Paper text:
Previously, our group and others found that type IV pili, filamentous helical appendages polymerized from protein subunits, promoted microcolony and biofilm formation in C. difficile. T4P are helical fibers extended from the cell surface through the noncovalent polymerization of thousands of protein subunits called pilins. Here, we report the ability of two C. difficile pilin subunits, PilJ and PilW, to bind to DNA in vitro, as well as the defects in biofilm formation in the pilJ and pilW gene-interruption mutants. Like PilA1, PilW has a single transmembrane helix (α-1N) followed by a soluble domain and a central α-helix (α-1C) with a β-sheet packed against it.
Additionally, we have resolved the X-ray crystal structure of PilW, which we use to model possible structural mechanisms for the formation of C. difficile biofilm through interactions between type IV pili and the DNA of the extracellular matrix. The majority of the two structures is superimposable, including the four strands of the PilA1 β-sheet and the C-terminal α-helix (which is also found in a superimposition of PilA1 and PilJ); the most obvious point of divergence is the αβ loop, which has a short helical section in PilA1, but adds two strands to the β-sheet of PilW. This loop appears to be highly flexible; in the four molecules of the PilW asymmetric unit, it can be traced in two distinct conformations (chains B and C), with insufficient density to resolve it in the other two. The conformer found in chain C of our crystal structure can be accommodated in our pilus model with only minor adjustments to the backbone, while the conformer in molecule B would require a total rearrangement, leading us to conclude that the chain C conformation is close to the native conformation found in the assembled fibers. While the C-terminal domain of PilJ extends out from the pilus fiber, PilW is nearly identical to PilA1 in size (the mature proteins, without the pre-pilin leader sequence, are 185 and 179 amino acids, respectively); but due to its extended αβ loop, PilW is wider along the helical axis of pilin incorporation than PilA1 or PilJ. Like other type IV pilin proteins from Gram-positive bacteria, PilW lacks the C-terminal disulfide bond found in the vast majority of their counterparts from Gram-negative bacteria. Unlike PilA1, PilW does not have a two-strand anti-parallel β-sheet in its place, despite the overall similarity of the two structures in this region. Equivalent residues in similar positions can be observed in the PilW structure, at Lysine 30 and Aspartate 85. Our comparison of the two structures reveals a region of striking similarity on what would be the interior face (buried in the assembled pilus), which may help to explain both the antibody cross-reactivity and the incorporation of multiple subunits into T4P fibers.
Residue numbers in the entry: 1 to 370, 1026 to 1080, 1089 to 1153
The structure:
Amino acid sequence: KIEEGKLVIWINGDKGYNGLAEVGKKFEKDTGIKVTVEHPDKLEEKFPQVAATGDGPDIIFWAHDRFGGYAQSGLLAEITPAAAFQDKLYPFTWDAVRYNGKLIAYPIAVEALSLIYNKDLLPNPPKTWEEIPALDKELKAKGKSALMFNLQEPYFTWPLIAADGGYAFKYAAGKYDIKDVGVDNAGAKAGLTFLVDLIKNKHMNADTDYSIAEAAFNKGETAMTINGPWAWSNIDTSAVNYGVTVLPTFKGQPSKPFVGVLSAGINAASPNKELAKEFLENYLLTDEGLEAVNKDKPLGAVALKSYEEELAKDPRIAATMENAQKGEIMPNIPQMSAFWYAVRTAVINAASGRQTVDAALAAAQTNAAAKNIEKAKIAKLEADISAIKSASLSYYADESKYTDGGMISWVKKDGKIIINGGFKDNLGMPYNGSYLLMSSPGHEKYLELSILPEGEISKSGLDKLKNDYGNLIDITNDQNKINIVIKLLN
């Protein structure tokens, strides 16, 4: 497994490993424990594999959104920072490294999209999205465009869509509700419509991707663009007088970009959790520690309050932090994968005019939430089946039969359950259909529960019921009233 008495650290190759190695030198100097900083490739997928076998690095640096999945697999240890140390970091950064109720990583850096503008073409960037059309008409008269940014990835268009109410997953009490997606709400409809209106009025092109927008801004063809700190170096080699500021507002509300928090997690299988904690809290997450890493590679905005005030001297870094505070922490749950494809398809379909804004977002809401909504409905259906079996078994232990009276029927009328003018002996009934229990007086091995669910169940849903009860289910009548029968006894 992992050798005791040392620290193995994984970080991406674009992060400051030479400066991080210097922090390890000062740590070895003061403690005698050697620290090796390696930056191998494909570590975001190498870690969950290798750590499942109880191996890997002691500390892993990566964006916070993948750590929630790691925590679900039990690959990350719970960190124990004192309240005194937590106050050294911005409070909202601690929310990016939370799964369930526990802290599972140290926040390091903070990144978000910002508005990048050409100071020669536009010395005063606009504060609102609504004034960009008139700015484009004024700039097109001189052969320039107002704004070009990547429309192919929902990461870049989401700040406008979410500004008026859109959200990925509802965050309630440290937990994300994977059944609640805010893609088809009124706010997302307003944001996407304004984006589509910009395209239909020839202010932007629906085929604009990352490379086309970056090339146009670097050659001084467009006055503005939307990008993150990773693109600054390509603008510096272009030498165009550019600035970085807060994203424009939409309907009086700020744009809400997804916030990415570079985080350091401790391997649950590491025998050096105290060493990792000591290194991260009192060596890396200091003014000297972050400066050494930043001298090797700029971190952008950082979660440490004391050092962020120093980095904020760069107005580009100050703008990145400002847009991040006004944005939404990117959910760290693996259900975001279905969110990305759903929104990506909706934006592309609406931008090219293949669907209406309502039809694109209605499909995306389905593409992002329907499978998780059905998973809950199926589990509640199985909860009723186990409850009916439990109550039927409790009748045997005290009486001498199952149903007693021949048949029992549950049918859901208008909000309540009824047993039809005759009581026998709380079931949510997620599909509002009908339950019916079959048993003839005699024997001890003949219980048959038949269900007539209302609504509809996908093929992936019915197959979930075939993977749980084996051959104990015979699904008939796939048209009109579907029928599910289960033998509650083995």
